[PDB]
Design a protein around this ligand. Structure first.
Ligand SMILES: *[C@@H]1O[C@H](CO)[C@@H](O)[C@H](O)[C@H]1NC(C)=O
Lengths: 441, 49
């Protein structure tokens, strides 16, 4: 029997319902999400890391001159400094005082740290949404499986065929561009490959961490060597990756809405409490029992003995009953007013049973379904003691949940007072108008 | 669970109350004063004899 419904996208809060099959007693169904994962499709754009400046030995040409040539090296620099007279431990290096030239070369390469300490720039697009579900039905214990939240791929869980519909919202915490550094993800609009600027995040860009083609854009300027010294001095803008690491700011892990948890393998947002999830589960036919084969419950009376509209199961109720066959009986509240903790109870020929529930309503009024029967529970609830709790609420608050009987009385008095007072004026006008008509006639 | 109340300043007369904790059965509480002492601060001015 296929049961179709919509459950909220809330991890850790179970969805409870009764599967009502004509001719068979209702079968209690419980579906709980273990986790929800939004897995976007990512494409690595480039890898950024701190640059290393490689400076080969300068060419010191005594009594002559040399010329620089271009080379296929990232940010390659070459400058010929004429009129040098270098000295070393062994004295003057060259004989000529002016016809003497030093050629300096320098280029940028990936640092050794780039193998471990680098940021990955990814293009992010929409992708697969997956979830893990925990399901029970009838006498069958908990079963779980990993399913695709797409509404097309069915999953076999405990011989039950479950279809989970697409999320009601396409929202995702990742922008079209993300930067993955370590375990953190940043919604950073990184510059495109080949357009990075010196001193900024993209000053060094590589398609892969092992790529042989490196783009480097730093103001690498060769400076003239100091008088008499053989060295290759240079000026360069500080690495933009180290600058970014200082200014990278708050990662998406810390600012993602809806309490999303960000994971990197694969990149995904987990447990985002967004929208609702349409579902369809086919319950095995062997799980259903005929009406005449189940105990019949009658003479039901529900008394709420305690109630607090706390996030936990702060309410307690006692249900008196009479039943035949004294068997097991599913318990469920189809109304959203209160969520019942117990799923089923053991019934005797006569007696009473208790159940716990959570509700936000100050005056709960809900229908409790007892296998083949139903009863209405009414009562009043006290405010909770704890201002702050470390657990999510088990119930959903409604617009009228906070309206007390006293407030409803005032609303009825105010609305009834103005309505009745206006109606009096309209009736009085119609009556006097008719009297004037009969004065003429 | 904190229970707050006002009891009379009487010695030997116990204060009785039920501590009602939401969701739990009430716990009977009995507080009795054995003695009460007002101990002012004193400065010896002098000794006479
Ligand atoms: C399903 O819920 C039951 C509750 O008793 C729990 O034991 C089980 O571990 C849950 N399934 C998963 C996959 O965690």
């Amino acid at each position: 029997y296929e049961h179709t419904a919509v459950m909220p996208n809330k991890v850790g809060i179970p969805y409870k319902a009764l599967v009502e099959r004509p001719g068979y007693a209702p079968v209690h169904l419980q579906i709980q999400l273990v986790n929800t994962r939004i897995i976007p499709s990512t494409n690595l754009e480039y890898i950024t890391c701190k640059y290393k400046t490689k400076v080969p030995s300068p060419v010191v040409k005594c009594c002559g001159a040399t010329q620089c040539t271009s080379k296929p090296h990232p940010d390659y620099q070459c400058q010929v400094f004429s009129g040098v007279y270098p000295f070393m431990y062994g004295g003057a290096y060259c004989f000529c005082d002016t016809e003497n030239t030093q050629m300096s070369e320098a280029y940028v390469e990936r640092s050794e740290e780039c193998s471990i300490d680098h940021a990955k720039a990814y293009k992010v697009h929409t992708g697969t949404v997956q979830a893990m579900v925990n399901i029970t039905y009838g006498s069958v214990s908990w079963r779980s499986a990993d399913v695709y939240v797409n509404g097309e791929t069915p999953a076999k869980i405990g011989d039950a065929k479950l279809i989970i519909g697409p999320l009601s919202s396409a929202w995702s915490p990742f922008d079209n561009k993300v930067v993955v550094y370590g375990h953190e993800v940043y919604n950073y609009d990184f510059p495109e490959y080949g357009t990075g600027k010196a001193g900024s995040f993209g000053d060094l860009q590589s398609r892969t961490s092992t790529s042989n083609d490196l783009y480097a854009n730093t103001n690498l300027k060769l400076q003239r060597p100091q008088a008499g010294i053989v060295h290759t001095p240079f000026t360069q803008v500080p690495s933009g990756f180290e600058r970014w690491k200082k200014d990278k700011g708050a990662p998406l892990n810390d600012v993602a809405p809806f309490g999303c948890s960000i994971a990197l393998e694969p990149l995904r947002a987990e447990n985002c409490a967004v929208g609702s999830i349409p579902i369809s589960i086919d319950i095995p036919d062997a799980a259903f029992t005929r009406i005449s084969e189940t105990p019949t419950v009658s003479d039901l009376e529900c008394k709420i003995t305690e109630c607090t509209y706390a996030f936990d199961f702060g309410g307690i109720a006692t249900v008196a009953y009479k039943s035949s066959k004294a068997g097991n009986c599913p318990i469920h509240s189809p109304s959203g007013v209160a969520v019942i903790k117990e799923n089923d109870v053991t019934l005797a020929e006569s007696g009473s049973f208790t159940f716990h529930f959570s509700t936000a309503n100050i005056h709960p009024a809900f229908k409790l379904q007892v296998c083949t029967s139903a009863v209405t529970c009414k009562g009043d609830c006290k405010p909770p003691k704890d201002h702050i709790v470390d657990y999510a609420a088990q119930h959903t608050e409604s617009f009228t949940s906070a309206i007390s009987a006293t407030a409803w009385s005032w609303i009825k008095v105010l609305v009834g007072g103005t309505s009745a007072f206006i109606v009096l004026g309209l009736i009085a006008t119609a009556v006097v108008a008719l009297v004037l008509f009969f004065h003429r006639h």
